[PDB]
């Protein structure tokens, strides 16, 4: 009674997730030191 | 679809709002920096690789960046902010620091550079198509006089609004974000550098 | 378990294209990102010796076998964990050349090579805090890591 | 993500609908110009030009299949309610005569005194 | 009721429209199978199948006439903007060849490097 | 990106012995281990 | 079980080896009989018969 017989039945076996870094890099605002900001809704 | 919001537990509007902010922020860099990269500079605004020499350390950008500072003081531009690619971060950070002795020559640290920003591009694969904003080409830099010839026109910052659902199909509200924004740039503020 | 399952996550996509007047808005898209998969393996070995060897051979004893189990076990460990690093088929992105040949340098001019490697590991964000090399280059590396 | 510690596979969740399709964006060729709120046949799409666009500009055509008001008919013909209305691209005018003209709509109100008609824009066949 | 305490008369009130008609339920035959968010021609209805299916299964085809993104095209042909595209049911791919193929849309955005095209689904004439 | 998976570090267990041949117990050591490695972490330097 | 509220699907995991196979049971024919601890060729198997098998009886061949 090898383990390979029961390898397919994943519901029986313990599940442990390989924890790892996932996601996407945050986007920073770089332009602001160069630019003078003027804000008016009626432009 | 309404089913997707309910049954797909991982899915939520927070991911969509997060992507709106990421795409929104990435595009703000595009409008406000692409004129600097894309502008057709003339010989007056272009400083060639003045370092050259023969067998210099790659902190011979110090020679090129120094002339660019000189070429701005002449014509009274007085560049204060340097924009380059992130590839040249190591060499530029060396020159802006106290570069070590070389052939007995002690090269002083470059001064009057308040800020250095490394604007790499940005890219996303939406659907079956890829959209990207080009960053600063590696081997180039731009001394910038800030806030005088550069003005950011902000009519609407950002307005995400949920809109036309379809009750007959149980499809959730379409969420649409939009802006009314622009930029003003100049050639009187910039001096291009090579390497 | 024998095999470890991968992590999963969702991300959205959108571009903020220009809007002219009608310009029917182009909707975004999501995607699913999944992590890598890892599995554990079984390594084993042993011995088989006749009873005569135990009794008539004065020098023979089980400690010599137990000692050899330890040496071949620790030798496996650093092989199992480091041989992926050595045996990998590195691409042009991961290969940094000598970059420091120059002409007539002291062979602490590997300093130019290590400096380039730190630059390349920082251009790409995979900054390398630890070096691995053969002991044949211990002297040059030690000079480079001090005040040349 | 650049320089992530471990490889990660990007599964693209496919979707088909890109936009509601009420209007189409087209680029004008070297012999095409558009005025705001006028009917043009540019790059196989017939609709209402939403922008003043010269040659080489980027112009939007509305193809909503809604009801539209146009004075660009050929005045010799008689446009009556229900008559299929076609677009003569050589003369740049609407016309009831099919011939080889594109089918663009169906008239809802007949030709009035000022040669104005109302029609419903048919799909982009 | 059935055990109604007092006789009464029912007067039916007629109405024709039953649903907006943006999508159609269809039943898959033996030779048919569907993947989510892909174009199919099942029982005379062409649209984006919203559900996976197999033999004898029931799925919903989205027929909104929206703008749609797809790269399931014959790569040899050039799909420029404005060109009509037809569904080759034998090849199960969009083609500009016409012939006996069903007319299904018109290209809004031409063929890019990755054989992607944006087209507007036509209203299933 | 370098992760070590350890289930059973090492176990030496003595086993079968042919008394009919006067053979001593077989001794076998075994361990359950795994390792995960990637190209995202490394740069190959030369000299 | 018999009173199971819900249907259940049985998933039989296979194993090939059943026994060590040092001895095989056999059936004696009419023209065959065995004495204990002696050699017989019963039903194509040759081995030591470990039981006194009469015709139609049960024995084990080593």
XYZ file of C-alpha atoms in Angstrom:
745
model
C 0.000 0.000 0.000
C 2.263 2.752 -1.297
C 1.661 6.452 -0.749
C 1.517 7.030 -4.512
C -1.856 5.264 -4.600
C -3.308 7.915 -2.269
C -1.375 10.818 -3.824
C -4.203 11.702 -6.220
C -6.802 11.969 -3.427
C -5.631 15.411 -2.353
C -8.682 15.899 -0.119
C -7.221 13.395 2.356
C -3.693 14.810 2.371
C -2.723 17.875 4.369
C -2.575 21.073 2.311
C 0.175 23.567 3.161
C 0.571 26.587 0.898
C 4.076 27.658 -0.087
C 3.950 31.158 1.385
C 5.719 33.645 -0.872
C 5.766 37.326 -1.805
C 3.014 38.130 -4.315
C 1.425 41.305 -5.614
C 2.530 44.354 -7.574
C 4.736 47.334 -6.828
C 3.149 50.542 -5.593
C 3.383 53.441 -8.051
C 4.914 56.586 -6.566
C 4.345 60.160 -7.748
C 7.728 61.478 -8.895
C 6.785 64.642 -10.797
C 5.748 66.838 -7.870
C 9.145 68.427 -7.009
C 9.434 69.543 -10.643
C 5.875 70.866 -11.014
C 4.043 73.810 -9.477
C 0.462 72.689 -8.859
C -2.424 75.078 -9.543
C -5.922 73.728 -8.877
C -9.145 75.403 -9.993
C -12.307 73.530 -10.926
C -13.266 76.162 -13.527
C -10.176 75.776 -15.723
C -21.363 40.625 -13.142
C -23.316 40.463 -9.891
C -22.586 36.746 -9.554
C -18.860 37.493 -9.668
C -19.024 39.952 -6.769
C -20.983 37.494 -4.630
C -19.569 34.035 -5.329
C -15.918 34.947 -5.996
C -14.860 35.534 -2.399
C -11.380 36.858 -3.214
C -12.812 39.421 -5.644
C -13.924 42.775 -4.270
C -14.207 46.368 -5.433
C -11.084 47.166 -3.384
C -8.929 45.456 -6.014
C -10.581 47.520 -8.749
C -10.141 50.731 -6.752
C -6.530 49.745 -6.082
C -5.878 49.318 -9.802
C -7.555 52.659 -10.515
C -5.125 54.363 -8.154
C -2.134 52.525 -9.604
C -3.102 53.330 -13.193
C -4.034 56.876 -12.171
C -0.745 57.508 -10.363
C 1.289 55.927 -13.157
C -0.350 58.153 -15.757
C 0.248 61.318 -13.723
C 3.945 60.557 -14.069
C 3.400 60.167 -17.812
C 1.740 63.535 -18.474
C 4.148 65.491 -16.310
C 7.427 63.780 -17.282
C 6.907 62.651 -20.889
C 7.288 66.243 -22.218
C 10.773 66.313 -20.703
C 11.763 62.964 -22.226
C 9.920 63.433 -25.521
C 10.895 67.045 -26.258
C 13.115 67.577 -29.306
C 16.080 69.188 -27.581
C 18.364 71.475 -29.577
C 22.143 71.800 -29.453
C 21.904 74.607 -26.894
C 20.072 72.312 -24.449
C 22.183 69.199 -25.200
C 25.465 68.508 -23.399
C 27.371 65.609 -24.927
C 29.287 63.020 -22.898
C 31.954 65.494 -21.820
C 33.612 62.845 -19.656
C 34.926 60.613 -22.460
C 38.615 60.905 -21.453
C 40.299 57.518 -22.001
C 40.029 54.846 -19.320
C 38.043 56.859 -16.757
C 36.039 55.266 -13.998
C 32.315 55.301 -14.806
C 32.032 58.172 -12.312
C 33.384 60.195 -15.247
C 29.734 61.176 -15.496
C 30.974 63.627 -12.849
C 32.681 65.456 -15.711
C 29.521 65.397 -17.834
C 27.153 66.323 -15.010
C 29.528 69.113 -13.984
C 29.465 70.704 -17.441
C 25.676 70.407 -17.514
C 25.563 72.411 -14.289
C 27.919 74.932 -15.888
C 25.893 75.032 -19.109
C 22.780 75.870 -17.066
C 24.433 78.651 -15.046
C 25.472 80.026 -18.398
C 22.106 81.067 -19.879
C 20.975 81.424 -16.227
C 18.854 78.255 -16.157
C 20.541 76.955 -12.963
C 19.264 73.399 -13.003
C 18.490 72.026 -9.543
C 16.724 68.665 -10.079
C 18.249 65.788 -12.051
C 15.971 63.228 -13.720
C 17.565 60.036 -15.042
C 16.852 56.319 -15.325
C 17.201 53.901 -12.436
C 19.951 52.075 -14.348
C 22.353 54.988 -13.776
C 21.511 55.205 -10.060
C 24.784 53.620 -8.929
C 27.043 55.852 -11.015
C 25.080 59.046 -10.345
C 24.937 58.389 -6.601
C 28.722 57.958 -6.645
C 29.344 61.279 -8.397
C 26.868 63.116 -6.164
C 28.836 61.713 -3.197
C 32.492 62.299 -2.350
C 34.086 60.368 -5.215
C 37.341 58.770 -4.147
C 40.848 59.712 -5.233
C 41.709 58.844 -8.840
C 45.225 59.144 -10.292
C 46.000 61.505 -7.422
C 43.046 63.753 -8.338
C 40.535 64.367 -5.540
C 37.226 65.128 -7.259
C 34.822 67.079 -5.003
C 31.235 65.989 -4.551
C 28.764 67.669 -6.886
C 26.652 70.232 -5.021
C 23.511 72.242 -5.796
C 21.535 69.123 -6.744
C 18.644 69.205 -4.283
C 16.771 66.170 -5.630
C 17.477 63.289 -8.001
C 14.549 61.220 -9.300
C 14.765 57.974 -11.276
C 11.688 57.755 -13.513
C 11.505 54.291 -14.983
C 8.556 53.540 -17.220
C 5.335 51.759 -16.320
C 3.476 48.924 -18.003
C 0.297 46.889 -17.616
C -1.305 44.057 -19.586
C -5.031 44.832 -19.731
C -6.970 42.238 -21.684
C -5.028 40.926 -24.668
C -3.154 44.233 -25.135
C -0.182 45.793 -23.351
C -0.039 49.515 -22.573
C 3.126 51.212 -21.350
C 4.621 54.616 -20.571
C 8.260 54.993 -21.565
C 10.681 55.975 -18.823
C 13.914 57.899 -19.103
C 16.183 56.191 -21.608
C 19.223 54.663 -19.853
C 22.318 56.725 -20.492
C 20.482 60.060 -20.362
C 19.657 62.686 -17.770
C 17.928 66.051 -17.499
C 18.864 68.930 -15.219
C 15.585 70.673 -14.386
C 14.787 74.130 -13.047
C 11.619 73.355 -11.047
C 8.253 75.029 -10.560
C 8.836 78.100 -12.776
C 8.413 76.847 -16.340
C 6.520 73.753 -15.132
C 2.894 74.191 -14.042
C 0.367 71.421 -13.399
C -3.176 72.259 -14.508
C -5.696 70.427 -12.305
C -9.359 70.968 -13.178
C -10.591 67.668 -11.697
C -8.253 65.486 -9.662
C -10.167 62.212 -10.008
C -13.861 61.259 -9.880
C -14.792 57.581 -9.748
C -18.549 57.175 -10.173
C -20.629 54.011 -10.373
C -23.018 54.141 -13.308
C -25.163 52.135 -15.693
C -26.018 48.733 -14.282
C -28.363 46.313 -16.056
C -31.062 45.025 -13.722
C -32.420 42.664 -16.380
C -29.064 40.817 -16.454
C -27.905 41.253 -12.826
C -24.708 43.055 -13.825
C -23.309 45.466 -11.270
C -22.770 49.191 -11.752
C -20.093 50.153 -14.241
C -17.439 52.112 -12.339
C -15.777 54.887 -14.351
C -12.973 57.208 -13.249
C -12.002 60.288 -15.234
C -9.901 63.435 -14.981
C -9.595 66.916 -16.462
C -5.861 67.582 -16.193
C -2.948 68.876 -18.218
C 0.597 70.147 -18.028
C 2.714 73.093 -19.111
C 6.430 72.590 -19.804
C 9.289 74.525 -21.372
C 12.644 74.331 -23.128
C 14.002 77.250 -21.062
C 14.234 74.981 -17.980
C 15.970 71.810 -19.207
C 19.442 70.700 -20.261
C 19.824 67.173 -21.619
C 22.779 64.991 -20.641
C 24.302 61.894 -22.237
C 25.479 59.212 -19.807
C 3.139 17.073 2.727
C 5.099 15.598 -0.146
C 4.171 18.593 -2.333
C 3.370 22.140 -1.203
C 0.574 24.048 -2.921
C 1.074 27.467 -4.490
C -0.141 30.811 -3.193
C -2.753 32.748 -5.179
C -3.843 36.360 -5.565
C -5.943 38.647 -7.768
C -5.012 41.954 -9.391
C -6.831 44.442 -11.601
C -5.788 46.272 -14.758
C -6.656 49.677 -16.218
C -4.865 52.314 -18.261
C -6.701 55.704 -18.297
C -6.699 56.251 -22.044
C -7.544 59.655 -23.474
C -11.209 60.606 -23.867
C -12.140 62.816 -26.809
C -15.893 63.375 -26.747
C -17.701 60.082 -27.266
C -14.737 57.690 -27.049
C -16.635 54.776 -25.495
C -14.628 53.892 -22.433
C -12.407 50.813 -22.606
C -13.037 48.641 -19.564
C -10.322 47.056 -17.458
C -9.461 43.456 -16.685
C -8.352 41.282 -13.773
C -5.780 38.508 -13.633
C -4.810 35.790 -11.169
C -1.194 35.412 -10.052
C -0.070 32.078 -8.593
C 3.123 31.295 -6.719
C 5.615 28.465 -7.206
C 5.328 24.833 -6.103
C 7.807 22.941 -3.913
C 8.132 19.265 -3.010
C 10.233 17.329 -0.501
C 12.186 14.195 -1.412
C 13.603 11.168 0.401
C 17.355 10.536 0.520
C 18.590 7.293 2.049
C 21.542 4.907 2.255
C 22.876 2.168 4.497
C 25.303 -0.678 5.109
C 25.270 -4.473 5.292
C 28.116 -6.318 7.034
C 28.485 -9.966 7.996
C 28.733 -10.973 11.645
C 32.290 -12.161 10.960
C 33.448 -8.619 10.171
C 32.133 -7.346 13.504
C 33.859 -10.011 15.591
C 37.177 -10.859 13.904
C 38.110 -7.364 12.653
C 39.497 -5.421 15.613
C 39.415 -2.063 13.829
C 35.880 -2.472 12.476
C 32.991 -1.108 14.514
C 29.667 0.593 13.913
C 31.082 4.015 14.848
C 33.064 4.090 11.601
C 29.794 3.588 9.726
C 27.922 6.129 11.858
C 30.734 8.618 11.271
C 30.482 7.992 7.528
C 26.713 8.490 7.680
C 27.278 11.957 9.121
C 29.907 12.956 6.565
C 27.799 11.769 3.631
C 24.727 13.378 5.217
C 26.166 16.861 5.730
C 27.835 16.535 2.332
C 24.396 15.898 0.852
C 22.894 18.916 2.611
C 25.188 21.597 1.230
C 25.032 19.817 -2.130
C 21.232 19.636 -2.174
C 20.902 23.293 -1.201
C 23.803 24.824 -3.172
C 24.019 22.640 -6.293
C 20.952 24.410 -7.780
C 23.028 27.593 -7.624
C 26.111 26.064 -9.254
C 24.315 23.888 -11.806
C 21.851 26.519 -13.053
C 22.161 27.574 -16.699
C 22.559 31.300 -16.130
C 21.266 33.674 -18.794
C 22.933 36.828 -20.096
C 20.938 38.889 -17.594
C 22.374 36.996 -14.614
C 25.936 36.674 -15.977
C 28.288 39.563 -15.208
C 31.588 39.310 -17.072
C 35.032 39.883 -15.570
C 34.586 43.672 -15.969
C 37.880 44.641 -14.477
C 40.353 43.139 -16.921
C 41.633 46.685 -17.613
C 45.408 46.530 -18.251
C 48.203 45.737 -15.802
C 46.129 45.741 -12.584
C 46.837 44.207 -9.241
C 44.587 41.158 -8.961
C 42.625 42.982 -6.316
C 41.176 44.334 -9.593
C 38.496 41.735 -8.949
C 37.244 44.719 -6.924
C 36.123 46.099 -10.284
C 34.288 42.820 -10.910
C 32.566 42.692 -7.520
C 31.655 46.371 -7.851
C 30.023 45.622 -11.202
C 28.126 42.687 -9.690
C 26.754 44.880 -6.903
C 25.737 47.370 -9.589
C 24.008 44.689 -11.666
C 22.233 43.241 -8.624
C 20.937 46.753 -7.838
C 19.864 47.730 -11.375
C 17.581 44.753 -11.191
C 16.184 44.845 -7.673
C 17.744 41.478 -6.654
C 20.349 43.042 -4.378
C 22.739 40.308 -3.270
C 23.805 40.525 0.368
C 25.871 37.290 0.327
C 28.636 36.102 -2.000
C 29.621 32.517 -2.779
C 32.897 31.540 -4.423
C 35.564 28.871 -4.489
C 38.285 28.941 -1.858
C 40.855 29.439 -4.636
C 39.817 33.120 -4.807
C 39.773 33.668 -1.035
C 42.801 35.977 -0.985
C 41.619 38.304 -3.751
C 38.071 38.434 -2.381
C 39.334 39.211 1.115
C 41.468 42.059 -0.238
C 38.491 43.421 -2.185
C 36.269 43.352 0.912
C 38.858 45.457 2.805
C 40.668 48.739 2.150
C 42.526 48.017 -1.088
C 6.627 42.960 -10.544
C 10.370 43.320 -11.193
C 12.941 41.617 -9.004
C 10.450 39.526 -7.061
C 12.018 36.741 -4.964
C 10.325 33.815 -6.742
C 8.811 33.129 -10.171
C 5.076 33.709 -10.442
C 2.708 32.800 -13.269
C 0.224 35.373 -14.573
C -3.166 33.811 -15.361
C -5.150 36.266 -17.483
C -8.865 36.016 -16.664
C -10.265 36.401 -20.173
C -13.137 38.750 -20.932
C -14.605 39.803 -24.276
C -16.493 43.081 -23.847
C -14.112 46.038 -24.183
C -16.601 48.910 -24.546
C -20.328 49.436 -25.025
C -19.806 50.095 -28.741
C -21.988 53.195 -29.019
C -19.187 55.204 -30.677
C -16.020 54.344 -32.599
C -12.694 56.183 -32.780
C -11.207 56.624 -36.259
C -8.156 58.361 -37.721
C -8.725 60.603 -40.727
C -6.813 59.937 -43.937
C -5.113 62.514 -46.165
C -8.360 63.289 -48.037
C -10.840 63.395 -45.148
C -12.007 66.268 -42.952
C -14.851 66.395 -40.433
C -17.083 69.043 -38.897
C -18.740 68.664 -35.519
C -22.101 66.868 -35.510
C -22.137 65.903 -39.192
C -22.393 62.563 -40.962
C -19.269 60.987 -42.457
C -18.190 57.558 -43.707
C -14.623 57.161 -42.420
C -12.884 53.766 -42.379
C -16.008 51.715 -42.997
C -17.953 53.276 -40.092
C -20.813 55.689 -40.755
C -21.896 58.006 -37.979
C -22.007 61.482 -36.500
C -18.589 63.129 -36.285
C -18.207 64.396 -32.717
C -15.039 66.437 -33.440
C -13.796 69.021 -35.889
C -11.075 66.898 -37.461
C -8.691 67.761 -40.275
C -6.608 65.257 -42.250
C -4.546 63.132 -39.880
C -6.586 64.066 -36.794
C -8.374 61.694 -34.401
C -12.168 61.850 -34.719
C -15.075 60.037 -33.064
C -18.155 58.745 -34.891
C -21.405 58.101 -33.029
C -23.027 54.851 -34.192
C -25.603 54.562 -31.401
C -28.398 53.403 -33.776
C -30.476 56.256 -32.363
C -32.685 58.738 -34.224
C -30.885 61.518 -36.088
C -31.726 64.751 -37.905
C -29.958 65.514 -41.187
C -30.306 68.133 -43.917
C -27.712 66.416 -46.151
C -30.188 64.668 -48.457
C -30.218 64.830 -52.238
C -33.053 67.256 -52.905
C -34.254 65.783 -56.211
C -35.455 62.563 -54.576
C -38.533 62.264 -52.358
C -37.861 60.891 -48.869
C -40.959 59.391 -47.237
C -41.483 57.745 -43.871
C -40.232 54.164 -43.882
C -38.147 54.411 -47.050
C -34.676 52.946 -46.675
C -32.050 55.688 -46.912
C -28.563 55.120 -48.339
C -25.315 57.102 -48.313
C -23.749 58.189 -51.616
C -20.087 58.505 -50.663
C -19.159 60.112 -53.994
C -21.605 62.995 -53.494
C -21.413 62.804 -49.667
C -25.208 62.936 -49.370
C -28.047 60.676 -48.316
C -30.089 59.062 -51.073
C -32.996 56.640 -51.329
C -31.598 55.041 -54.498
C -29.764 51.922 -53.350
C -27.436 51.341 -56.323
C -24.068 50.454 -54.713
C -24.569 52.934 -51.859
C -24.188 51.870 -48.246
C -27.373 51.246 -46.267
C -27.338 53.671 -43.345
C -30.841 54.064 -41.912
C -34.596 54.249 -42.340
C -36.555 57.490 -42.618
C -38.969 58.297 -39.776
C -40.190 61.704 -41.025
C -40.583 62.583 -44.676
C -38.830 65.367 -46.536
C -40.280 68.577 -45.094
C -40.181 72.024 -46.708
C -36.563 72.683 -45.674
C -35.397 69.235 -46.906
C -34.886 68.050 -43.308
C -35.550 64.396 -42.481
C -35.420 62.219 -39.385
C -34.099 58.674 -39.621
C -32.924 55.823 -37.407
C -29.314 54.858 -38.041
C -29.096 51.217 -39.084
C -26.230 48.965 -37.928
C -22.818 48.960 -39.581
C -23.516 46.453 -42.343
C -58.756 29.978 -5.879
C -60.147 26.601 -6.835
C -62.560 26.535 -3.900
C -63.539 30.097 -4.689
C -66.465 31.356 -2.553
C -67.883 33.629 -5.290
C -67.653 33.386 -9.103
C -65.290 35.812 -10.804
C -63.888 36.479 -14.272
C -60.229 36.767 -15.273
C -59.369 39.345 -17.955
C -55.862 38.848 -19.315
C -53.806 41.914 -20.248
C -51.325 41.381 -23.067
C -47.733 42.552 -23.370
C -45.115 41.552 -25.936
C -41.706 42.540 -24.555
C -40.489 39.989 -21.993
C -36.786 40.770 -21.605
C -34.203 43.228 -22.885
C -32.747 40.577 -25.199
C -29.076 41.375 -24.594
C -28.312 37.654 -24.147
C -29.852 34.379 -25.307
C -30.115 30.998 -23.624
C -29.085 28.132 -25.914
C -28.744 24.360 -25.535
C -25.501 22.727 -26.657
C -25.746 19.864 -29.142
C -23.555 16.752 -29.290
C -20.847 18.310 -31.462
C -20.671 21.562 -29.467
C -18.763 22.700 -26.394
C -18.097 26.152 -24.959
C -15.415 27.961 -22.987
C -16.161 31.009 -20.866
C -15.834 34.382 -22.613
C -15.276 32.991 -26.111
C -17.225 33.447 -29.324
C -19.423 30.635 -30.622
C -22.207 30.068 -33.153
C -24.786 27.863 -31.407
C -28.271 27.447 -32.904
C -28.108 30.460 -35.191
C -27.023 32.822 -32.381
C -23.505 34.266 -32.474
C -22.150 35.816 -29.303
C -19.856 35.531 -26.316
C -20.565 32.339 -24.386
C -20.692 33.319 -20.714
C -20.590 29.766 -19.276
C -18.588 26.622 -19.909
C -20.584 23.776 -21.388
C -20.574 20.284 -22.821
C -22.958 18.080 -24.794
C -26.573 18.784 -23.909
C -25.637 21.651 -21.583
C -27.260 25.093 -21.461
C -25.290 28.352 -21.721
C -25.900 32.061 -22.310
C -24.520 33.927 -25.332
C -24.014 37.665 -24.870
C -25.277 39.454 -27.995
C -25.107 43.036 -26.718
C -23.644 44.475 -29.970
C -20.917 45.946 -27.777
C -17.295 46.404 -28.808
C -15.422 43.129 -28.297
C -11.755 42.163 -28.008
C -10.562 38.915 -29.562
C -7.514 37.378 -31.233
C -9.322 34.269 -32.548
C -8.684 35.360 -36.132
C -7.057 33.746 -39.127
C -3.575 35.219 -38.838
C -2.869 35.183 -42.585
C -5.522 37.809 -43.357
C -5.068 41.499 -42.591
C -7.809 42.812 -40.282
C -7.697 46.564 -40.848
C -10.099 49.004 -39.230
C -13.541 49.108 -40.819
C -13.247 45.772 -42.614
C -16.174 43.426 -42.070
C -15.351 40.129 -40.363
C -17.245 36.869 -40.793
C -17.376 33.752 -38.633
C -15.880 30.659 -40.274
C -17.734 27.953 -38.361
C -15.631 25.226 -39.982
C -12.413 26.918 -38.853
C -14.121 28.500 -35.803
C -12.302 31.777 -36.483
C -13.052 35.277 -37.715
C -12.273 35.827 -41.401
C -12.720 38.603 -43.944
C -13.234 36.002 -46.695
C -17.050 36.125 -46.453
C -18.135 33.386 -48.923
C -20.780 31.380 -46.987
C -19.528 32.633 -43.606
C -21.896 34.416 -41.235
C -21.415 38.178 -40.969
C -20.714 38.935 -37.309
C -19.018 42.308 -36.964
C -16.776 45.081 -38.223
C -13.258 45.847 -37.005
C -12.862 49.017 -34.931
C -9.140 48.595 -34.153
C -6.927 46.954 -36.736
C -4.759 43.896 -36.295
C -1.944 44.603 -33.848
C 1.300 42.643 -33.509
C -0.341 39.899 -31.407
C -3.255 39.337 -33.843
C -5.626 41.167 -31.464
C -8.567 43.076 -32.937
C -11.405 45.161 -31.530
C -14.693 44.786 -33.392
C -18.360 45.626 -32.889
C -20.639 42.597 -32.861
C -23.331 42.930 -35.514
C -27.027 42.284 -34.722
C -27.375 38.727 -36.036
C -29.301 39.434 -39.240
C 13.582 32.875 -2.747
C 15.628 30.151 -0.998
C 13.475 27.980 1.272
C 14.501 24.774 3.041
C 11.846 22.126 3.687
C 12.641 19.765 6.578
C 10.236 16.992 7.599
C 12.567 14.302 9.009
C 16.143 15.496 9.487
C 17.759 12.048 9.775
C 16.884 8.665 11.267
C 19.207 5.656 11.348
C 17.365 2.409 12.107
C 18.831 -1.099 12.212
C 16.820 -3.811 10.488
C 16.917 -7.229 8.885
C 19.564 -9.810 9.762
C 19.959 -13.222 8.162
C 20.454 -15.432 11.203
C 20.665 -18.328 8.743
C 23.826 -16.702 7.321
C 24.998 -14.962 10.525
C 24.616 -11.517 8.957
C 24.350 -8.535 11.274
C 21.507 -6.026 11.142
C 21.305 -3.828 8.075
C 21.688 -0.192 9.139
C 19.992 2.407 6.931
C 19.799 6.177 7.353
C 17.098 8.199 5.628
C 15.691 11.714 5.700
C 12.800 13.725 4.260
C 14.041 17.060 2.909
C 13.297 19.562 0.179
C 14.745 22.755 -1.235
C 13.355 25.592 -3.357
C 15.687 27.812 -5.395
C 15.300 30.368 -8.166
C 17.125 32.469 -10.761
C 15.607 35.670 -9.348
C 18.232 35.808 -6.568
C 21.645 35.262 -8.181
C 24.302 36.792 -10.421
C 27.165 34.704 -11.827
C 30.476 36.531 -11.470
C 33.591 35.430 -13.358
C 36.999 35.755 -11.687
C -23.883 1.586 5.026
C -27.431 0.442 4.273
C -29.218 3.314 6.018
C -27.028 5.956 4.412
C -28.939 9.270 4.074
C -26.934 10.422 1.036
C -25.293 8.734 -1.967
C -21.566 8.115 -1.606
C -18.980 7.267 -4.261
C -16.484 4.537 -3.403
C -12.882 5.157 -4.502
C -10.934 1.901 -4.349
C -7.177 2.510 -4.150
C -5.350 -0.418 -5.716
C -2.478 -2.501 -4.393
C -0.980 -5.330 -6.424
C 0.900 -7.487 -3.915
C -1.406 -9.551 -1.694
C 0.916 -12.036 0.030
C 4.619 -12.825 0.220
C 4.094 -15.781 -2.110
C 6.307 -18.368 -0.423
C 3.513 -20.963 -0.656
C 0.460 -21.551 -2.844
C -2.783 -23.250 -1.873
C -4.013 -25.957 -4.247
C -6.916 -28.360 -4.761
C -6.341 -32.095 -5.100
C -7.775 -33.859 -8.133
C -9.284 -37.345 -8.059
C -6.038 -39.066 -9.059
C -3.890 -37.146 -6.565
C -3.102 -37.444 -2.862
C -0.308 -35.972 -0.755
C 1.719 -36.852 2.327
C 3.060 -34.147 4.613
C 6.535 -32.753 3.889
C 6.982 -34.341 0.463
C 7.281 -33.105 -3.106
C 4.315 -33.030 -5.486
C 3.409 -31.335 -8.773
C -0.181 -30.288 -8.020
C -1.921 -28.075 -10.597
C 1.287 -27.013 -12.310
C 2.981 -25.921 -9.063
C 5.899 -27.942 -7.696
C 6.698 -27.674 -4.009
C 6.651 -29.291 -0.598
C 3.139 -30.387 0.368
C 2.705 -29.318 4.000
C -0.565 -31.216 4.573
C -1.835 -34.781 4.195
C -4.147 -34.160 1.265
C -6.751 -36.662 0.164
C -8.445 -36.280 -3.212
C -10.568 -33.142 -3.222
C -8.900 -31.915 -0.014
C -6.957 -28.675 0.592
C -3.164 -28.467 0.954
C -0.351 -25.921 0.810
C 2.691 -26.197 -1.461
C 5.890 -24.515 -0.281
